[PDB]
Each structure stands twice: as C-alpha cells, then as structure tokens.
C-alpha cells in the first residue's frame, strides 16, 4: 500500500525535515503584554526548562492532517410537496445537542418547495459557527481569501499567517481550505520561500503536497543550498517511497544509492530542473571539500 500522510514513518520523516527552531516556534507575539517573571536557574535547571520548551514546541508543531476533499452532501430526507409555495424562505434546523460531534450533527434544510434535505457542507460549517462559535472563525468568509488579497499577503511574505487564517476559518477537508493551501504552496515554490514554513506545522503539508505533485525540485535545491543534506536525502527517500513505480525510485533500487547518490539519481531521473540540482549539489561538494578538510 502507498503510505498515508499520518503514517509513523512519514510523520517522523516530516518532523525531521521541519526542524525545531525554538526561537521561531516561540517568536514573541504582538498581543496584550504582561510584566515578565524571572527565575534563578542552574545549568541543570536551565537545561530542564529548555527541554520542556522543546516538548511544548513539538506539541505546537503537530502537523495538521491532510485530508481528501469532502464529497458534497446531496441527500433528500423527505419531499413534502404539500408545503410547496407555502413559505418563500428556507428553514435551517440545527441540532444543537452539546455532546454530539460537529460532523455528526443533523443540520437539515426545509426548502420552499417542501423538500427537507440535508444541509450542504458550507451551510453545515456556517450553522456550526453560528451556534457553536469557534474562536478565530467568521460566519461570513473573510475577504482576505480573495486572490487579490492573497497575492498581497504573499508579497508581504506572510504565508504562515495565510495558512493560520485558512486553518482557523475553513475545515481541513473543505474545498476552500485545500484551494488556499495549494495556492500558498504554489506561491512558495515559485518564489522559493520554503524557509518561511520551516519550524512550523505547515512544512509537513507543504512537503507532502510537493511530493504528491512531483515538483520537489525547488525544495531540494533550497535544502542543498541551506546545507540540509540529511533533510534532502530524507525528502528523496520519501519521494521514492511514495512513487515506487517511479523511474528514479527504480534506479535507486537497482544501484546501492544510500546517501548523496540518491540525490544524484533523482537529479538524473524524474527532476525537471535536474541539471541545476546537480550543479547545486556539485557546488555543495566543492564547498565541503574546501572547508571540511
């Protein structure tokens, strides 16, 4: 079976690729500030506090699950033709029972034509927000998600902010969430701004999107330039794992491609910019020979 995003090996690979830049993960936030508190710590106490901060950062960077687009809801519970034309406005009945999970709530729509149907996904999310208000979400779709504003946010290099807004507003399996995430990933790949998403929980999603679209050339180039050779090798190995039938994976299987030779094989096979990938890898090898020795 082809591995899924939430598989343990893939999760570990993406966690290693993401990085754990502790300053970036806990960058100071522009909010209502309170006077800080100071503790006197020994070296062991400071190390323990740093380790606890690392654990908290790992909890914070838990990658959101990538889900396939939800199938549109099209179900008619009843067709009461007697009610046709009685009312000129739909009725949206929402089961607001507290203990029911939000994806098991029965939200129904009584149409003016007398049709009692199940609520669409958009209506479901709207009513869930109306009657169970989640912080950070709006009933009406914010105008920030329009493309004219998305391009401005990308120009301001606020891709992480865009993804945070998308996660807050839309559900992970919604059409809008997937579309916005893909647009952000495309812009990041085009402008080569991958380092923006490093040490953030969206890096795994970006890597998975690139691998599933077989355009990991730019990320590999950035990792080689940023001397993340182990991460680049992990990315190539994950690409081969998710494309066992791929020619690059077959070539890696045939030879004993264990380290940098994996990246060489990927550059020579199944890379759109393989020549430039090989050139950058050669430049890294030259720098390593120059300075390591």
């Amino acid at each position: 079976k082809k591995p899924t995003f939430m598989d343990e090996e893939v999760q570990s690979i993406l966690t290693k690729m993401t990085g754990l830049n502790l300053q970036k993960t806990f960058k100071p936030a522009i909010q209502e500030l309170k006077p800080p508190t100071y503790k006197l710590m020994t070296q062991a106490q400071l190390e323990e506090a740093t380790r606890q901060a690392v654990e908290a950062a790992k909890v914070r960077l838990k990658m959101p699950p990538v889900l396939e687009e939800r199938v549109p809801i099209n179900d008619v519970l009843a067709e009461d033709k007697i009610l046709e034309g009685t009312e000129t406005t739909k009725y949206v009945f929402t089961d607001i029972s507290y203990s029911i999970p939000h994806r098991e709530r029965f939200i129904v729509v009584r149409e003016p034509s007398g049709t009692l149907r199940k609520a669409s996904w958009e209506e479901r999310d709207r009513m869930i927000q109306v009657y169970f208000p989640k912080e950070g979400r709006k009933i009406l779709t914010p105008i920030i998600f329009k493309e004219e504003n998305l391009r401005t946010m990308y120009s301001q290099d606020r891709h992480v902010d865009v993804l945070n807004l998308c996660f807050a507003q839309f559900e992970p399996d919604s059409t809008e969430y997937i579309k916005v995430h893909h647009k952000t990933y495309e812009d990041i790949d085009k402008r080569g701004k991958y380092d923006l998403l490093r040490s953030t929980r969206y890096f795994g999603g970006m890597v998975w999107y690139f691998v599933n679209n077989k355009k990991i050339d730019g990320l590999l180039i950035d990792q080689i330039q940023r001397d993340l050779i182990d991460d680049a090798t992990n990315l190539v190995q994950l690409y081969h794992v998710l494309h066992p039938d791929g020619q690059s994976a077959q070539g890696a299987k045939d030879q004993a491609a264990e380290g940098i030779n994996l990246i060489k094989v990927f550059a020579k096979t199944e890379a759109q910019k393989g020549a430039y990938i090989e050139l950058t890898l050669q430049t890294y090898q030259e720098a390593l020979s120059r300075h390591s020795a």
């Binding site: 508190t37 503790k39 070296q43 106490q45 914070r60």
Partner: protein, 215 residues
C-alpha cells in the same frame, strides 16, 4: 546640549528680618536628564526667578545619578520605598504600557529615559521628598547582571507572549553555582494590600485605569 531641563516646583519663600521686614526669595526644584539614564535634580535659591532657574539647572548636572534601565525602557524590578513621609511604589511594566505615574515622576522618567513604568505615591506628596526618594530608589535598584553575579545563577526571563521559552537575560561572570537553590514553598515577602486588592478585583476605585493622554 544632550540634556533637557524641567522645572518641578517654584516656591516663594519668605523670612522675617529686622532690616527689611519680610524678605522674599524663590526656591526652584529642577530636574535635568539626557534621556539615556543620566539624570539629576537640584534646588536653586535666588531673588530672581531666572537666576534661580540658572543656578539649579547648572548645579543639577554636577549631581547626575545614573539610572539603570532594563531593555533601555523600564526599571529592572519593582521598587517600594519610603523617603521621609512619602511612599513610592514603582512597578516594572512591559513595552507599550506607557508612563502611568505621578506627573512629576512622568517628567523625571522622561528625563531619565524610562518609557514604561507604574508609580503610586502615598502619604506626603511633597515634591522635594518625592523627587529625592524616586532618585534614591532608582539608583539603588539592582540589575539582572548584579543579581546573577551575587547569587551565581542564570537569571532567566519567562514571558507569556513567548510561551514556555526560557530567555537567559543574565549569567554569572564567575563560576556558576550548582546548588539547585531552595524551592521555597511559601515566599516570606511583605505584600502590599492595594496590589492584592487590585489582583483579586475587590478594588473598585472610579479613578483607576481612567483613559488619559499619551505619556
């Protein structure tokens, strides 16, 4: 030229002399400061107001305290002092909190270079005693580096906006102390009733937290 001069009090003082009856003079309290920690205050006595201003402002620059500012915007820690019959309670505040302090303390903090601090004055509000106690407390404050050197331990800052990230703001100059320090179950610290009342919400003064112009 880098120093700014501010008046804090101008009093007309009279004396009983046989030769002239009631002699009149002017006593002026003047605070000077360069906006970078170095600030001072002085008293000028003169028959003419401008002469008193000149005397006090020329004498102040020879009596410049250097006030240590945390991150160049605030005091290093809370300062509770009682100079004569004037109590001054200064609270360290984060960036952007502004100067919520007595107007004289606001002026003196602007002269020093402090941009965020709280200050409550209780008891006698005598301007001279207020200024003297404020300068005494600010000069006697202990910096983070001094605390780290004194107790041989890392002084680590915990910020709510930064989450659980430990920020080592100070480290001892000499060898570090491996004693994990006493985990004091209950701190024997003399609290202030007003602070506790405000924290618990029992305080309902109609004058606290009033909207005011930028300071």
């Amino acid at each position: 030229e880098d120093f700014d001069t501010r008046i804090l009090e101008v009093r007309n003082v009279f004396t009983m002399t046989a030769k002239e009856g009631r002699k009149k003079s002017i006593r002026v309290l003047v605070a000077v400061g360069n906006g970078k920690g170095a600030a001072g205050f002085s008293i000028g006595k003169a028959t003419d107001r401008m002469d008193a201003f000149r005397k006090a402002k020329n004498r102040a620059v020879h009596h410049l305290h250097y006030i240590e500012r945390y991150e160049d915007h605030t005091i290093f820690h809370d300062i509770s002092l009682r100079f004569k019959r004037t109590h001054i309670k200064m609270k360290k505040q984060p960036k952007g909190y502004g100067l919520r302090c007595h107007r004289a303390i606001i002026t003196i903090c602007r002269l020093i270079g402090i941009k965020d601090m709280y200050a409550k004055v209780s008891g006698s509000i005598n301007m001279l005693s207020l200024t003297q106690g404020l300068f005494r407390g600010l000069s006697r404050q202990e910096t983070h580096q001094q605390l780290a050197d004194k107790k041989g331990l890392h002084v680590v800052e915990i910020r709510e906006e930064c989450g659980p990230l430990p920020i080592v703001v100070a480290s001892p100059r000499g060898p570090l102390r491996k004693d994990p320090e006493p985990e004091d179950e209950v701190p024997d610290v003399k609290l202030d009733w007003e602070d506790v009342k405000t924290a618990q919400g029992m305080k309902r003064s109609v004058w606290s937290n009033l909207k005011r112009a930028a300071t």
